[PDB]
Amino acid sequence: NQKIAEEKRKRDEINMVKDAIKLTSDFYRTIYDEFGKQASELAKELASVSQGKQIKSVDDALNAFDKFRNNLNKKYNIQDRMAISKALEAINQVHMAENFKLFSKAFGFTGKVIDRYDVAVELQKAVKTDNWRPFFVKLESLAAGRAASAVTAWAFSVMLGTPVGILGFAIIMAAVSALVNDKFIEQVNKLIGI
Fold this sequence. Notes:
The PDB classes it as antimicrobial protein. The chain is mostly helical.
């Protein structure tokens, strides 16, 4: 029966990769429908740059993200971030874990993937309080081997499960950029008119 189990393992990995690719194409198309063409292309470019690449230190990410924050807070207030965190409250944990596994497989993250819903809870807290250091520490900690693939997969798995609005989209993508590549933050700033 060892033979049959091994054949099933091979078949199941192949089907996992198939499901992952379909999930990413679907994700880009729903990003297109919900936030626009430029947002979809930004997500595509960021997921591309993330594959194979390594993340930055928490200090560098927090520097770029503090720039993004101080630009954001001059036009968007606390009611807006409260709306974002209330939207994040509606994440389905099982769906998020499965989407995280699939996105990790799709972006080249070969590490074993855990349900990291706690990072989403910390995201809610950080959006409410504008205190972002513990969130970034946890996000770095889930990136096994400093892999940006993991952080991009986690962000996409979070955004898939809820309708966060363009503001929450911009905030999440700006955090991912700060960890992966500051270059996108500028583009992110164009989505929310800043």
